[PDB]
Design an enzyme around this catalytic site. Structure first.
Site, PDB file in Angstrom:
ATOM      1  N   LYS A 109       0.824  -1.209   0.000  1.00  0.00           N
ATOM      2  CA  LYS A 109       0.000   0.000   0.000  1.00  0.00           C
ATOM      3  C   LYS A 109       0.864   1.269   0.000  1.00  0.00           C
ATOM      4  O   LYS A 109       0.692   2.141  -0.846  1.00  0.00           O
ATOM      5  CB  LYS A 109      -0.916  -0.031   1.226  1.00  0.00           C
ATOM      6  N   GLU A 113      10.386  -4.246   5.448  1.00  0.00           N
ATOM      7  CA  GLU A 113      10.629  -5.610   5.051  1.00  0.00           C
ATOM      8  C   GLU A 113      10.455  -5.724   3.552  1.00  0.00           C
ATOM      9  O   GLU A 113      11.193  -6.443   2.904  1.00  0.00           O
ATOM     10  CB  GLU A 113       9.719  -6.626   5.736  1.00  0.00           C
ATOM     11  N   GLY A 115      -5.275  -2.884   4.644  1.00  0.00           N
ATOM     12  CA  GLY A 115      -4.503  -4.049   4.244  1.00  0.00           C
ATOM     13  C   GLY A 115      -5.241  -5.375   4.480  1.00  0.00           C
ATOM     14  O   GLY A 115      -5.266  -6.252   3.633  1.00  0.00           O
ATOM     15  N   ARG A 116      -5.880  -5.503   5.654  1.00  0.00           N
ATOM     16  CA  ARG A 116      -6.549  -6.735   6.052  1.00  0.00           C
ATOM     17  C   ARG A 116      -7.922  -6.887   5.387  1.00  0.00           C
ATOM     18  O   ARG A 116      -8.561  -7.917   5.565  1.00  0.00           O
ATOM     19  CB  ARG A 116      -6.686  -6.795   7.579  1.00  0.00           C
ATOM     20  N   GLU A 124      -6.511  -7.677  14.360  1.00  0.00           N
ATOM     21  CA  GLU A 124      -6.033  -6.366  13.969  1.00  0.00           C
ATOM     22  C   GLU A 124      -7.166  -5.351  13.892  1.00  0.00           C
ATOM     23  O   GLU A 124      -6.937  -4.165  14.170  1.00  0.00           O
ATOM     24  CB  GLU A 124      -5.233  -6.473  12.677  1.00  0.00           C
ATOM     25  N   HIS A 148      -7.111 -34.484  16.542  1.00  0.00           N
ATOM     26  CA  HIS A 148      -6.105 -35.360  17.106  1.00  0.00           C
ATOM     27  C   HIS A 148      -5.154 -34.603  18.025  1.00  0.00           C
ATOM     28  O   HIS A 148      -4.251 -35.221  18.603  1.00  0.00           O
ATOM     29  CB  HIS A 148      -5.337 -35.992  15.950  1.00  0.00           C
ATOM     30  N   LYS A 170       6.156  -0.512  12.631  1.00  0.00           N
ATOM     31  CA  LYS A 170       6.941  -0.191  11.451  1.00  0.00           C
ATOM     32  C   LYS A 170       7.929   0.959  11.705  1.00  0.00           C
ATOM     33  O   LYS A 170       8.718   1.259  10.806  1.00  0.00           O
ATOM     34  CB  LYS A 170       5.975   0.171  10.313  1.00  0.00           C
TER      35      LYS A 170
HETATM   36  O1  LIG Z   1      -1.895 -37.263  20.158  1.00  0.00           O
HETATM   37  C1  LIG Z   1      -2.418 -38.342  19.769  1.00  0.00           C
HETATM   38  O2  LIG Z   1      -2.544 -39.400  20.454  1.00  0.00           O
HETATM   39  C2  LIG Z   1      -3.035 -38.359  18.359  1.00  0.00           C
HETATM   40  O3  LIG Z   1      -2.802 -37.164  17.631  1.00  0.00           O
HETATM   41  C3  LIG Z   1      -2.409 -39.491  17.561  1.00  0.00           C
HETATM   42  O4  LIG Z   1      -1.023 -39.183  17.333  1.00  0.00           O
HETATM   43  C4  LIG Z   1      -3.178 -39.691  16.264  1.00  0.00           C
HETATM   44  O5  LIG Z   1      -4.523 -40.054  16.593  1.00  0.00           O
HETATM   45  C5  LIG Z   1      -2.599 -40.789  15.428  1.00  0.00           C
HETATM   46  O6  LIG Z   1      -2.685 -42.013  16.245  1.00  0.00           O
HETATM   47  P1  LIG Z   1      -1.798 -43.245  15.661  1.00  0.00           P
HETATM   48  O7  LIG Z   1      -0.332 -42.790  15.755  1.00  0.00           O
HETATM   49  O8  LIG Z   1      -2.134 -44.405  16.585  1.00  0.00           O
HETATM   50  O9  LIG Z   1      -2.183 -43.478  14.167  1.00  0.00           O
HETATM   51  O1  LIG Z   2      -2.634  -4.545   8.258  1.00  0.00           O
HETATM   52  C1  LIG Z   2      -1.740  -3.724   7.915  1.00  0.00           C
HETATM   53  O2  LIG Z   2      -1.890  -2.474   7.775  1.00  0.00           O
HETATM   54  C2  LIG Z   2      -0.315  -4.271   7.723  1.00  0.00           C
HETATM   55  O3  LIG Z   2      -0.237  -5.683   7.835  1.00  0.00           O
HETATM   56  C3  LIG Z   2       0.167  -3.912   6.328  1.00  0.00           C
HETATM   57  O4  LIG Z   2      -0.620  -4.639   5.367  1.00  0.00           O
HETATM   58  C4  LIG Z   2       1.653  -4.212   6.204  1.00  0.00           C
HETATM   59  O5  LIG Z   2       2.353  -3.400   7.152  1.00  0.00           O
HETATM   60  C5  LIG Z   2       2.183  -3.889   4.843  1.00  0.00           C
HETATM   61  O6  LIG Z   2       1.955  -2.445   4.648  1.00  0.00           O
HETATM   62  P1  LIG Z   2       2.142  -1.962   3.107  1.00  0.00           P
HETATM   63  O7  LIG Z   2       1.031  -2.665   2.308  1.00  0.00           O
HETATM   64  O8  LIG Z   2       1.976  -0.452   3.175  1.00  0.00           O
HETATM   65  O9  LIG Z   2       3.538  -2.436   2.597  1.00  0.00           O
END
Ligand SMILES: O=C(O)[C@@H](O)[C@H](O)[C@H](O)COP(=O)(O)O
Ligand SMILES: O=C(O)[C@@H](O)[C@H](O)[C@H](O)COP(=O)(O)O
Ligand SMILES: Cn1ncc(Br)c1N
Ligand SMILES: Cn1ncc(Br)c1N
Lengths: 551, 551
Positions: free
Chosen positions: A216, A222, A277-278, A363, A394, A516
């Protein structure tokens, strides 16, 4: 342009809602509500019809709400002047009071070319003209007619920008990736961290890469740094600065800075100060989207937003879908004291949807001062979080089901997959999870059921589920461009509603503005090698430890 | 194995901390604390030395804490028996009471081969033997000696798993991507959503793709479905089931199910019941990491965890870094009533670090029942969220700076970048942001400064910043494998601490266990075409609307 009231707590319905919270809200049984009201699903669900006659079901009926509570929240919205502020927004009034700007993202998706004036001057054709520029350019990238400096078609498009100039393009290109074409890829550099540049450009060819510098202001630290580094990378191969004109375009409000950076004015896609921006993916900032999936799909996404705008503008509050969503958020935030709001797409394409909404929400509504220029004495914006399901089930769903915190949640599912592999087996399983999770959060599992299922003694409480944990379920037919447009606009207008009740300015961001300018003083200190003693002792210690450890 | 107390609120120091909150905590001025205590940075920061003599600075001095408060929190930890539970964990005792299991992720990274027994039997050599299997296999993938069914080296490795069997491999391969080699790529299918399979496999070659089926139980619905679909994709090209043996391996506890799926037992990498999913990346589940960055780097990551384990085991509480972190979390959660905790890596490689910690934290500590098998009457686990900086500064940092919610935050920076492009310009800018953001959250900007900077009248409050917003800053030298190992283990032991004070079982997950049986009933209903009336009216309505809209 002043406020009709000072604090939300001044609105007469606020104290009445506090009383209702005590007598009905705190102990609210959703199971009892269904048992009392055979039409509860019908009464607390709404079908939205989009401009293309596609539909989205918004079911609020598993929330801690009934007719009495909702009617009270609607009265609060009327007392807060939600409709008056909304009408002022659509009128092009300068409702961003602290920056004295209009708030006119709705004008970006005015495909109907309604009269939509800022400062008494219609914006319809100016907006349309940028869109026609976007269509012509994106078409020429996609059809191969726009060639790079060695005469080759473009294969890769790199957006460089941060915040509002990054997250919408990221999320929307991810969400609509089914509409992309093989051999034309989009990439997104945003972090100042040099990793982001190095990893992104590692395998790209300067001859077939186009950059869009999205800013903008066109002054963000950045972004201008990243853009400079990308230009250096390009010139390491291309040698001559005359070739920049085929490889760099700008998405900006600031023509002078764009040209000064060495981009051709013809390759600028403009927008105005009244695009936050948002709220900017609908503008020139969405050019990466138009390139990735085609301008017609981008336009369909805009028309979806427009249809939700018309719904918000024209619907009485009691049937106005984004308003209802916003009223429930206020209910939980300010009466239950729930600090968070969870958003869970049962949709892998929408994996960055929660992060996008986190920006939009927090924001906009993370403010402590009202339109009457007094400090609040009540909660404003919630903390939004989420990840896609079924992964989330999970993971942190353990806490959602059995923790000590109330976490209002929105679950989103498309009835149809873009990828209905294995005769839709995966889609049926995904959808079954969508239904069953919200069912379980409501129904829970009491002591007697745990015992019947075989637990004894001290294990039993561990396996109980309270239920009466609220969800909103949003069921779309399919996540098309139009559907996504409507969904984002829903959340925009939900955010609007909350902010209107809190009497804050949803449209400034004085903390991100401060951010900024913050780092420059220290940056100068990191440039010379002496130890620093100009800050508090922690800042000094961190800086000095860094200096000892740095390359 | 029973508890020494019922509720955290029963601990005598709890009421004393409530009193301290009222008199000193609620109104705590961090600016005043620095002014009162010239040694505050020294007193509230700790250097951790890793096994490789690299260092990590943990600076807690911008928190709402002083000597009095911390000494009280330490006394609470002693009353809660944090040390006794920790010692029981390291002893291989069955401290996961509800599942009657040991909790022995610490045994996975026992590279020193200390005696670490479960059920009176040393685990050291069994763990080591799996690691030696992982080294041999990952070496053969990386050096090209493991060939696919047409005799070509593997170019792509696809992990298929969900939750604990997915997010660690994702986050750690992302975090350590600088250590990867060109031409050997890793991919991660996890969501049941068929999009995840379709998009992941779209451009891969079955002849040069290896799958790792990651599942502790080897019965998880999503994973076995995804694995079946990948096998179908493979066989569409390969034709003969005999070729599966060169292309599919399993990471599991359940040999019978692996073989029954048609994987060769020789290609199983085992682990034990005492490895929780959210503590499993250190096990066979980390095989994708060893393949991507090499076993030696994987081993360095384990040794980093081991060194932090030794720190946690051997350090008095008042200097025990993960304990201090955990005590501050309890302070904010239970005394300030902050529901969330923010984690912000100033590091693009660590972009999935917050999501990983979200699982670790919330799945461990989102519980309502204590080790005495009574319900809590106080808050347990917090809601964790975050995104990398500097992106986050442009986004939800608005609310962090100017909203109405207290959000304890951890910021993490490496002094050295793996990608120090442009003579470290990008790294210096990144670091300047790290320092300046935490400075600004503490210092704020009062009315008088806003006026001096040029605001008048009603604009002034809008531009004020409260300050006294707490951060923890963690400064590493560089995010190496060893450093990441230590960082994860820090958070593991921080999680441990919190859970020990709350007197919950950090190591079960009866909500995620319920989740894996919930959806089957509805799945059967989505399989036949009749309308459903077997649930509550919302569930029925959602299902029936889906049936009308589905392909
Ligand atoms: O934190 C947990 O227990 C779950 O996210 C498991 O990792 C997920 O359900 C996968 O289970 P599994 O590794 O037995 O396939
Ligand atoms: O929500 C905002 O205003 C910021 O995230 C801007 O989008 C961000 O700082 C980038 O600004 P600019 O678009 O002027 O480079
Ligand atoms: C409360 N909330 N939920 C999503 C969004 Br966007 C907002 N503001
Ligand atoms: C409170 N907190 N912060 C990070 C993590 Br893991 C936990 N449990």
């Amino acid at each position: 342009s002043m406020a009709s009231f000072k604090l939300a707590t001044d609105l007469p319905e606020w104290k009445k809602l506090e009383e209702t919270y005590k007598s009905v809200g705190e102990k609210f049984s959703v199971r009892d509500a269904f048992a009392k009201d055979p039409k509860r699903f019908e009464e607390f669900s709404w079908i939205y019809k989009n401009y293309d006659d596609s539909k989205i079901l918004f079911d609020f009926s598993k929330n801690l709400v009934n007719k009495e509570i909702l009617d009270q929240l609607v009265t609060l919205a009327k007392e807060a002047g939600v409709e008056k502020l909304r009408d002022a927004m659509f009128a092009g009034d300068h409702i961003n009071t602290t920056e004295d700007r209009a708030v006119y993202h709705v004008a970006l998706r005015n495909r109907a070319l309604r009269k939509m004036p800022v400062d008494g001057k219609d914006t319809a054709q100016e907006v349309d003209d940028v869109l026609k520029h976007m269509k012509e350019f994106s078409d020429s990238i996609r059809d191969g007619s726009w060639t790079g400096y060695t005469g080759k078609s473009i294969t890769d498009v790199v957006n460089i920008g941060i915040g509002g100039s990054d997250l919408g393009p990221v999320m929307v290109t991810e969400a609509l990736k089914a509409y992309s074409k093989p051999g034309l890829n989009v990439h997104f550099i945003s972090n100042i961290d040099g990793t982001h540049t190095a990893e992104t450009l590692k395998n790209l060819n300067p001859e077939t890469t186009l950059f869009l510098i999205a800013s903008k202001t066109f002054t963000t630290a950045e972004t201008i740094t990243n853009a400079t580094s990308a230009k250096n990378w390009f010139l390491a191969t291309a040698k001559d600065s005359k070739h920049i004109a085929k490889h760099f375009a700008a998405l900006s409000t600031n023509e002078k800075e764009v040209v000064a950076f060495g981009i051709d004015a013809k390759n600028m896609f403009g927008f105005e100060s009244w695009v936050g921006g948002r709220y900017s993916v609908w503008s020139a900032i969405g050019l990466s989207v138009a390139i990735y999936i085609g301008f017609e799909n981008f336009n369909d996404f805009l028309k979806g937003a427009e249809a939700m705008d018309q719904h918000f503008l024209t619907t009485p509050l009691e049937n106005n879908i984004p308003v209802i969503g916003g009223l429930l958020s206020v209910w939980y935030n300010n009466f239950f004291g729930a600090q968070t709001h969870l958003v869970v797409p049962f949709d892998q394409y929408l994996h960055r949807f929660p992060a996008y909404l986190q920006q939009l929400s927090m924001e906009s509504n993370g403010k402590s001062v009202t339109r009457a220029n007094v400090f609040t004495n009540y909660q404003t914006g919630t903390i939004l979080f989420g990840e896609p399901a079924t992964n989330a089930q999970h993971s942190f769903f353990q806490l959602v089901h059995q923790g000590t915190k109330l976490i209002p949640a929105d679950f989103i599912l498309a009835a149809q997959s873009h990828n209905p592999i294995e005769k839709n087996l995966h889609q049926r399983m995904l959808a079954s999870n969508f239904f069953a999770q919200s069912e379980a959060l409501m129904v829970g599992k009491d002591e007697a059921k745990v015992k019947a299922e075989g637990a004894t003694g001290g294990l039993v409480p561990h396996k109980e589920f309270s239920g009466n944990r609220p969800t909103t379920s949003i069921l779309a037919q399919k996540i098309t461009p139009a559907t996504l447009g409507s969904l984002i606009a829903y959340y925009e207008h939900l955010t609007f509603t909350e902010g209107a009740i809190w009497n804050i300015n949803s449209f400034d961001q004085w903390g991100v503005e401060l951010g900024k300018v913050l780092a420059k003083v220290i940056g100068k200190e990191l440039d010379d090698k002496k130890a620093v003693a100009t800050h508090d002792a922690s800042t000094n210690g961190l800086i000095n430890q860094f200096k000892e450890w740095e390359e």
